[PDB]
Amino acid sequence: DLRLHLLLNTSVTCNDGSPAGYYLKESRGSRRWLLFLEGGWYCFNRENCDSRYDTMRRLMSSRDWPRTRTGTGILSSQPEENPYWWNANMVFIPYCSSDVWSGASSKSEKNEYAFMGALIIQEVVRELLGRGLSGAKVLLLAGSSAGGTGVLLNVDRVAEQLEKLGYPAIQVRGLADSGWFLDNKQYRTEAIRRGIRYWNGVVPERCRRQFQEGEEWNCFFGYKVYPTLRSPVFVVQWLFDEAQLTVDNVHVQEGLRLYIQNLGRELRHTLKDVPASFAPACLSHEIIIRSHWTDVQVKGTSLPRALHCWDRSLHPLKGCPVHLVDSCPWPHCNPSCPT
Ligand SMILES: *[C@@H]1O[C@H](CO)[C@@H](O)[C@H](O)[C@H]1NC(C)=O
Numbered sequence: 001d002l003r004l005h006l007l008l009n010t011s012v013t014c015n016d017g018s019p020a021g022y023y024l025k026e027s028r029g030s031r032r033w034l035l036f037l038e039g040g041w042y043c044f045n046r047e048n049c050d051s052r053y054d055t056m057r058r059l060m061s062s063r064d065w066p067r068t069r070t071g072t073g074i075l076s077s078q079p080e081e082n083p084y085w086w087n088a089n090m091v092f093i094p095y096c097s098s099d100v101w102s103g104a105s106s107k108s109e110k111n112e113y114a115f116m117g118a119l120i121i122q123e124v125v126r127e128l129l130g131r132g133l134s135g136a137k138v139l140l141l142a143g144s145s146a147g148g149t150g151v152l153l154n155v156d157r158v159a160e161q162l163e164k165l166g167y168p169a170i171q172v173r174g175l176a177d178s179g180w181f182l183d184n185k186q187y188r189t190e191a192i193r194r195g196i197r198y199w200n201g202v203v204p205e206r207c208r209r210q211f212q213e214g215e216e217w218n219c220f221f222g223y224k225v226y227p228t229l230r231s232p233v234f235v236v237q238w239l240f241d242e243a244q245l246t247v248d249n250v251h252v253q254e255g256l257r258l259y260i261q262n263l264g265r266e267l268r269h270t271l272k273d274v275p276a277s278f279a280p281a282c283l284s285h286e287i288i289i290r291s292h293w294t295d296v297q298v299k300g301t302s303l304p305r306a307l308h309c310w311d312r313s314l315h316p317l318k319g320c321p322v323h324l325v326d327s328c329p330w331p332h333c334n335p336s337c338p339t
Pocket residue numbers: 009011012119
């Protein structure tokens with residue numbers, strides 16, 4: 001069980017002005033810290049944010065949050081469920097900003113909602129230094145779906161924050177799960193372009209300088225922002241991601257068969273020069289905080305093992321690979337896929 005702490009700085013808020021927060025489970029014999037970013041789509045104007053407030057309010061407010069959460073998957077403390085980092089300090093950061101963790105805008109007389117995702121991450125890091133993070137050797141910023149994209153947008157800013165605060169010894173790294181999307185043609189970019197304006201959204205400096213004003217939406221797409229990042233980032237992405245297919249209007253004849261095969265081929269291509277990655281040929285979405293995340297394998301290697309091999313590489317390894325991308329071209333050609 002991780003225990004809830006609401007942020008002491010009450011100016012850093014969820015969408016409706018209630019305080020943001022984090023769930024923490026300490027491990028005093030450990031200098032590793034795992035900070036996980038929750039996902040859950042987004043909203044990009046007044047009317048669709050109002051709708052989300054009616055029926056997805058826990059993703060916009062802390063007023064109804066429970067006092068504890070069970071750590072599952074990579075956030076579990078039992079070695080049988082989490083062979084990778086079972087002894088680490090565990091942090092779950094709830095997603096209540098609806099902005100893919102990019103916003104820096106307060107609620108005010110001109111703004112009905114606050115979009116403070118990028119500031120929530122910074123404030124969590126600041127307050128955790130007083131609870132033990134000051135002694136860390138590794139800070140792994142992880143996240144799933146919109147939280148996975150959030151890792152790509154924020155990992156270098158976290159590294160810069162700790163440098164300027166006087167902690168150059170803490171190594172900051174990223175783990176982006178199911179947040180690596182393609183801006184491809186549908187089967188039958190605009191919402192993010194509107195979102196960034198609505199949220200006062202922020203993207204990494206080197207990527208923003210390449211694409212410049214009005215084109216910062218490009219930095220939300222993994223294959224475009226990843227080459228600009230300096231921190232080490234491990235990328236987990238199903239080749240046939242269900243959220244990718246949703247936005248592509250895919251719900252089997254030749255036309256659709258070729259569409260699906262070309263989508264897997266394009267995703268595989270964008271990962272060819274990503275040295276730390278895990279990309280199985282499955283139709284699914286998210287994995288790292290699922291209890292059965294130990295089950296899937298690529299070329300005979302599990303995801304917890306690949307992450308362990310990544311740790312060793314950051315001290316090629318014999319029988320310990322870190323780049324694992326399926327080559328077979330159809331969903332569930334890998335027998336280990338989630339049932
Ligand atoms: C609280 O957070 C806001 C927004 O990031 C910041 O401007 C302010 O300085 C913070 N206050 C303190 C006391 O850290």
